[PDB]
């Protein structure tokens, strides 16, 4: 009646293939419409054509800074342990969505940005810079002034303290840019990911505002950090559901954004990562 001996420690392609399914039946049934993302006037706001935000969950921008700003951005709200608007899963912005990117951050009061990519990965472009680098002059993205004061550089990730001056108003955002990525079957490379989630949660915990989290397409590594962050936030309150499961968690998280964890490797890391968390703590 109170697992304070969290016995969860106890093939993987099979649980996952079940997630592959579901999201197949979801479409054949026209369950989660992505119509707003298919509008002819947004075709250039999506980094991939087959990765569209669900309407029902899409983040809608109201903050208008021009006679052209629409209410659109590839972004979805992921609920936390207590409710919705806990997480904001998004794609790396494009040259044409930076301003959209910053409006969102601003309109929702986001204080923490976790980017799980590298400008370039494997000789390829994955993200358009939206952040400011120290030493540089300010970088204007429409009416938003992005600056950088300092940045802690750890072994696997960087902490960028950014100063965003919209009008004459100034907010301080914290960018956690995660370069290297620790794959699955390397039970030791996971540690740093927890390093991050703990570090992140050291800046923002019991705060109304969401944590903007994005990788490139906003669904691969982005889901992992959320799923993991979510199980550990549960673990942090022992509120872990009795029948809790890494599968169950990804399932519904996969209800907010299409393919929130797109590879088995990612599915397994999410798993060995929850395991370590429980093994630990105690
Ligand atoms: O094999 C795959 C996935 C292949 C690739 N993906 C990844 C992607 C891809 C390749 O390298 C990447 C590097 C990145 O940094 C990101 C990214 O950040 O957004 C995405 C990719 N393009 N396709 N998976 C499957 C997923 C779900 C269901 C299936 C059912 C049958 C067979 C395969 C399935």
Confirm or deny that 202 is annotated as ligand binding: no
Catalytic residues: 215
3-state secondary structure of 41: helix
How far apart CA 45 and CA 95 sit, in angstroms, is 9
- Domain total of the chain: 1
How far apart CA 161 and CA 148 sit, in angstroms, is 6
**How many helices (H) and strands (E) are present in the chain, helices listed first?**
7, 8
Here the CATH number for the domain that contains residue 142 is: 3.90.190.10
Domain that holds residue 269: 1-282
Q: Which residues pair with 76 in a beta bridge?
A: 58, 89
CA-nearest of 226, 230, 231 to 257 is 226
Confirm or deny that 70 is annotated as ligand binding: no
Residues near 14 by Cβ (< 8 Å), separated by ≥ 6? none
Q: What is the resolution of this structure in A?
A: 2.8
Confirm or deny that 142 is annotated as ligand binding: no
Q: Which residues pair with 165 in a beta bridge?
A: 145, 170
Alpha-carbon distances, residue 1 vs 6, 190, 238, 242, 248 (angstroms): 11, 31, 12, 8, 20
Residues near 241 by Cβ (< 8 Å), separated by ≥ 6? 234
| Residue identifier of the C-alpha nearest atom 29 of ligand 1 | 20
Q: Ligand 1: distance of its center to the CA of 87 in Å?
A: 22
Residue with tokens 């490797």: 265
How far apart CA 103 and CA 175 sit, in angstroms, is 16
CA-nearest of 107, 50, 47 to 74 is 47
Q: Does 119 sit in the ligand 1 pocket, CB within 6 Å? A: no
CA-CA-CA-CA torsion sign (119, 124, 127, 129): positive
Q: Does 116 sit in the ligand 1 pocket, CB within 6 Å? A: no
């Amino acid at each position: 009646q109170r697992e304070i001996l969290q016995k969860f420690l106890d093939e993987f392609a099979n649980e996952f293939l079940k997630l592959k399914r579901q999201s197949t039946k979801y479409k054949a049934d026209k369950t989660y419409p992505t119509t707003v993302a298919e509008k002819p006037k947004n075709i250039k706001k999506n980094r991939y054509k087959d990765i569209l935000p669900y309407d029902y969950s899409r983040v809608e921008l109201s903050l208008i800074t021009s006679d052209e700003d629409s209410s659109y951005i590839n972004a979805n709200f992921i609920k936390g342990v207590y409710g919705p608007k806990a997480y904001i899963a998004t794609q790396g912005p494009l040259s044409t969505t930076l301003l959209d990117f910053w409006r969102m951050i601003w309109e929702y009061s986001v204080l923490i940005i976790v980017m799980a990519c590298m400008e370039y990965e494997m000789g390829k472009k994955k993200c358009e810079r939206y952040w400011a680098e120290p030493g540089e002059m300010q970088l204007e993205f429409g009416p938003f002034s992005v600056s950088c004061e300092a940045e802690k550089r750890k072994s696997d990730y960087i902490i960028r303290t950014l100063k965003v001056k919209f009008n004459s108003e100034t907010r301080t955002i914290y960018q956690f840019h995660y370069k290297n990525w620790p794959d699955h079957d390397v039970p030791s490379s996971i540690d740093p990911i927890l390093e991050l989630i703990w570090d992140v949660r050291c800046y923002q915990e019991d705060d109304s505002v969401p944590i903007c989290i994005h990788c490139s397409a906003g669904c691969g590594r982005t889901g992992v950090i959320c799923a993991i962050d979510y199980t550990w936030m549960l673990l942090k309150d022992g509120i872990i559901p009795e029948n809790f499961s890494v599968f169950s968690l990804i399932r519904e998280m996969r209800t907010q954004r299409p393919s929130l964890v797109q590879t088995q490797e990612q599915y397994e890391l999410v798993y060995n990562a929850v395991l370590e968390l429980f093994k630990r703590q105690m």
